[PDB]
């Protein structure tokens, strides 16, 4: 086990302190420090340092809930990269939260007994929990493209607000498309309307609009 | 033996000077500089440099107590990674504190005679002693939510004061909940009281209150 | 599998944030972080972090198209470094995009089953897709030297717009020369026209004009 | 072949951006990054990144001219550290500019076939070309000492304009002296005129004037 | 001979400038730069750079005195690691201070003729002289706890003044305890007096007082 | 040959720009970057970068004069560490200033042919020339110890002004002593007057005064 640099952690903590929890730069920095699969000890101490007390409580709750969903999916499929083939490799929440035997407080033993699939599942769970808490602490149908705003900024803002919302995963693309069509002030509205081809994906709409946009 | 960089030690000392002993960034930095197993000379000089005189005295006391607990566990189990199989490898406190023969003041001889299990035990003992002294050096039942204070600030302050107190670990969540219910001025009190669902976690209470709070 | 440093990724993300997608320094930095053959997981997370949402959608599209061209060339030649000799080693797009069995979400298994030729093909495809999206996200024949603008600023702007355009590499110097001659308001036009020597390079024209320019 | 750090290149590019091309700190930094013998690929990409488009064109021109002078000296002496003893080792400009066979676009093959004498000659040529372009990209006989200006500022400005001009090196000191005597408003003119000793160096004149100047 | 880095020397000089001569961090840094056996030239230039003029004079005096004590011990024992077996290897102070023939001003010749025992003796002498001058340049029995001062500040000040004084190392703890008992205004005096347990360490006294102190 | 870091040179240039040429911190920094023996190329470029045009002219003059004094001492003693035993190793000023054959503009050849004694003599000459120019560009008998000034600051200022003046080297110590006795306001005057021992050195006077000074 190798610990994360306290210099990077201090810089990330100050980033969270000045920019907040929800800024795209903060989420990018968290994704950066969430690159290598971390042990429960690492993520727990990281969130202890960068988050205040109340956001840390919220994050512990959300992390537990997401890990429980993961364990339900794991008991629903014996081919989980955290599981094994026999029943003796089934992964309990004590092993995920670092509470199992030989792991409590010891990061070396933790790194010894944990699986790489376990590590990546814990890491993805912690990232999703961070996203939930950030969305909770401090509206996609109210987003309009400003008269002076460019289209890539509007698309970034809209996709951010739609993906970081309460919609099901299978309802984000149609909503993003229909919001591109009805928002995005009438010049781009007519540009999308008069599309000789049928655009059936937000990426394709973005590419088309970026090609044929009125340079100004 | 290779000494730690005085640049890292100076940066850590300034971190302790500005952030304090108990900040999570400071504990992360200490864990960072506590990564490789250190010899008693290294940890002793490190604490001499980063800590003031009175915290250094407290830390010497706490380190001695923790090492004594370790030696009691060692005489309670002949399979300690610091011990050996025969009685001639039993580890005395003079060998742990660096006071044994051939070690006093000489880090090279120290590194020669010491075991890796000895080093990791000394290191873990020093880390626990640092935690104790940090918790000791610098009231939750007196915390009220001010008339103008927001709820996340009140929750942060309350969770901080409850977790940094003398309560057992298994009594913090019920106390935090019952303090959310009885403190947190009567508007939020009635908001929590009339909860159609049963809230059984501080994170869930915080989420509910943040959702249904009176925007003002 | 070893992950890329989040410090390098954070520095690259800030580079993309300040300099943009198309600057030569940004492309050099991407080439730097594109040195070792990356697994689909690595490149996917890298583009997720450094690119915004809409450029990331565009990049996913372009990467898919380039990988499809690669797979067409692969079915057009059984000697692809990603292919094998028999038909059982033919590489499907599920194996290139990391969607095949034993690879979805698991970078360790990914690194296990993938070929080095597969890795380098994926990497080159991702680099070409990044170039396409950068050229798409953000006109030389409309550039005139303003009445008050100096000549070095005009030359900088013109060379920038000509080299960052859709012209072939072998057509940039003649175009830059003929734009120096026809733009660059009639004082400098006559200064270049009455050149006793024949100027056959943009650098030589710039040097001549800087020597004989009307100091004002 | 090992590439130069993009961090050093970014720092050097920002140095060139803020200080300019001609500052002594910039030339020192270039000499620093010009320490190990670089391959044509390295120097070419370095100048592509640190220099703008028009200075890069000028630098390509100057580098070609200096390399041609080097090749003329090489055909004038068969004992060039780039040449060999037989005629089969004669070095063509395609091999110096990296255009020869097995080198175009490939830095590894470049490093394979190139000689150390070739590398140092290319490097010195590139440094001289950079100096020429820096002197070219950015009048002594019009410099007067202002009524309110101090003498050290006037001397600095005059020596700067005289040394950064088209005079031969052996004509700068007499010109600086005779400009000290005829410029430098009549109080200092009479102070230099009535010098009991003969001052035959700009430094001696500066020292004398600083000693006997009218404190005001 | 290899010189010490001017970067390390500049950092050490600024450390001495901000922290002073007597801080434990400064002595640690000096011990760091005093790791390899230095030639008289190195130590002399080092003290010339890091110390001011008057401390440098004091240090020259103290270094001479300590070297004279070393030479007296050397003439009192022919088995000095600087001496040899015959009388022709006896080490004169001109050879220690670098004043002997073939050494004055030349570090290369110095490194040639000097012995490793000579180097380590010179180095230890210089370190002891630095300690003396630091103790000399910039009262524990006069320290009282002010009426408004907290107890941790008083303990810090007292431990600082007692450890940075002329007492033997084995007499600091009893003095600190007996000064806690007789200073530290009568409320804390009575608090320590009525201790049901016997406190036999400054850290234990500090912990007890911090526990049972009158919150105000 | 290894060049000096442009980062250190930039920091030193900014130090000279803000603090000036004569500040003790600037002279300490110059001594730091003057630690290893530099080649004429290094010192020449260093002074070109850190000094303005007029101070650079003055410094070239002073460096030439000091090197000429060195060469006179060298022809006055055939045992110069730059000289050799035979007449064929006599060192000409073209070899010291880097103007000799095989050295003009080439630092590698310079480092090849130069002697270490040559390097240290050039370095000491350049340092003395820098001191002269710094004293010249922007009075010891006017120095008084202020009513509130400490004694070590007064001693530093006085020794600085006396050693950086036009006095012979054999007249500095008596002047420093007699200035300690007559300046240094009457409390310290009487403290030095009533010295039971005879103080015959500035260091001894400083030590005595620091011992018996009135703590306040």
From Swiss-Prot, chains A, B, C, D, E, F:
Q: According to its UniProt record, where is this protein located?
A: Virion
The UniProt function text for this chain reads: Self-associates to form the irregular polyhedron core composed of hexamers and pentamers, that encapsulates the genomic RNA-nucleocapsid complex. Assembles as a tube in vitro. Binds to inositol hexakisphosphate (IP6), which allows the assembly of the polyhedral capsid.
Q: Which residues of the full protein are shown?
A: 250 to 468 of 701
* Coiled-coil annotated residue ranges, if any: none
Q: Positions of the site: Involved in capsid protein dimerization upon acidification?
A: 166, 178
Query: Disulphide bridges in this chain?
Result: none
What superkingdom does the record give? Answer: Viruses
The entry's protein name is Capsid protein p27, alternate cleaved 1
Subunit comment: Homodimer. Homomultimer. Homohexamer.
Q: Where is this region: Involved in capsid protein dimerization?
A: 41-49, 102-113
